[PDB]
Symmetry: C3
Subunit: 259 residues, 3 copies
């Protein structure tokens, strides 16, 4: 089913959003069908497309990465290859047995580009978005026209937007904190005077301002996620994917940078 | 056959112009040989390259498209494939039957890219312009060096330039008008007062100043095109192209 | 597989202009590769510039701002041109004098596969001169080893002075060649105006653009002598590269009459 101009414009806009927002559009639309793969989408699909994008952009450290949206076909190829390698590694056999419908398919380079071109790249821009990867991965029930029908005219609720942006503000505080850590680290290797101030600062860093600001940003995020979840996540507390993603992400953040 | 550095400089400059200018240069140069294919070039070739470019740039509506110049090999492949698809479609039989020498050829993807590397991509930039498509499609009688021979030192006449620019002024007024109609149309689906007010405004759109300015632009373009057509009708590709462009605009947006 | 610190260094080096990539690689591997330096300069670096130039729509070398890396399609052009150059009978002496610098012909498919599997070390879809070098000379060079060898080498200021002095020569070359081409074009004009352009073109070497280029050349020559006398660490690549480049500039823009 070719898309109307109106649906294509929608699709193209979603597909230029940061990957995580593409993911949430997908998850909201298909929550009834796909909720049990959410964890794979989050932990494996997202991480992998992000790493492929980082390399493309010559970024090594996650805290310096501004999240991307789509990949050219050569970079997509590295994405799908990395997916297959991850899932084929016995160290991750849990992911493979627990999420069969999420498993990628190994293909030669040639067959891969032919699938991108024939099937995955639905707006014909020579780019692969996370959205496009998702739709094709879950094609037993998902497809672009269906997706647009499901997702069009469902605007992000303001409580949800607040909570998403509060989470993005945690990212900003994490970057500020990790950049300063790394600043100090690299001065740490200045023998003398100093050189030496750097060391104590580094040693003291988690009682410093930037760590303080991160700790408080984590509380704000959490409060905002809660009020959004209470309002839209049903008991336990359409927007279900956004609710699940934000809680997952908060969880990850707290684990890594909380008390 | 291999371009001199001077011919190559020219060739590169023409391939950076918007596709439609690429088209005119090629048509002026080869009018004797190619004039009867002009409708295909305009209605199938050009339309298809513009849509390929459009998609690459994330544009769906022709009034929001700023005209491009070349495509990478992945987009080029979509372009050539869409040509084949269109021309093999029974509903387009008449383009296939009437314009046999303009028909594309089906290739696999590896065969295609290899053709783009070996034959089509004459300046080795990794891109396919409309000029490069055209030159190879009609290789029976055209080629790069002969094209540069035929095309260099034939400056666009000022009267023709003026008409071309007056036609682009129409495009600008089309865009302003369609952009307002779309904004109103959007607004129109808001529940209650606001939606109703925008539905009313849409009914008035053709009395409005945007439309007035489009009608004005159309009249000026028509004047400019007739001035140029009377004088020059070597320049035959440009005259054909601007009349064709003008006729289409008048049909869509004239009385 | 590089560490984060190494990979960052590598990516930074690979975004420098091709000639600085070259110097990085040559400074690092001078022991093992010294004898191929002329092939890297006159064949590898020329061919990669030209592929880059074409990609950017530039036809004349004096109009080109040096790049840093190529997409896979342009890399393919680069490798095919290397092979073509090396297979031309007129260039048999490059083939024979520099056998370890020799490229291998591949089909397009196989080329792109090798770019992807072997050459494109930082997985960015681009081929840098550094990447081409590391893989061509992989018998003794690899990315980790390179970073190990290079991260601890700094460009001494007298050497940077020299590099920059040579780039100043490039800017004066451009100004001169642009005026030569402008007069050349002007001398087309059939009347007495072609005659005036024709004469200015004929006299151009006694003009001030050429004078300014002569000064730049001489200043680069002092700056290069200073660097070379002090360090000729080790900065063996850099010292070789500046002198070689100076020699080239002298041959084309220095005294011409014998
Ligand atoms: Ca796409
Ligand atoms: Ca080209
Ligand atoms: Ca690379």
């Amino acid at each position: 089913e070719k898309l109307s101009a109106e649906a294509m414009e929608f699709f193209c806009n979603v597909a230029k959003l940061p990957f995580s927002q593409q993911a949430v559009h997908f998850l909201n639309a298909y929550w009834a069908e796909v909720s049990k793969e959410a964890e794979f989408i989050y932990s494996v699909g997202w991480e992998t497309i992000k790493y492929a994008d980082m390399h493309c952009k010559g970024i090594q450290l996650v805290f310096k990465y501004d999240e991307g949206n789509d990949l050219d076909f050569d970079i997509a190829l590295y994405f799908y290859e990395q997916l297959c390698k991850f899932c084929e590694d016995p160290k991750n056999k849990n992911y493979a047995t627990t999420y069969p419908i999420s498993q990628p398919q190994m293909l030669t380079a040639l067959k891969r580009k032919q699938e991108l071109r024939e099937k995955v790249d639905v707006n014909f821009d020579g780019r692969v978005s996370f959205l496009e990867y998702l739709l094709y991965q879950y094609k037993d029930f998902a497809n672009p026209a269906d997706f647009c029908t499901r997702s069009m005219n469902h605007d992000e609720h303001p409580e949800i937007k607040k909570a998403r942006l509060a989470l993005e503000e945690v990212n900003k505080r994490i970057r500020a904190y990790e950049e300063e850590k790394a600043r100090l680290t690299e001065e740490s290797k200045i023998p003398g005077v100093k050189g030496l101030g750097a060391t104590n600062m580094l040693a003291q860093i988690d009682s410093g301002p930037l760590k303080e600001q991160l700790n408080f940003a984590l509380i704000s995020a959490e409060a905002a996620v809660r009020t959004a979840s209470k309002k839209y996540g049903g008991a336990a507390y359409s927007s279900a994917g956004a609710i699940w993603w934000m809680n997952r992400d908060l969880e990850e953040k707290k684990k890594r940078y909380g008390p």
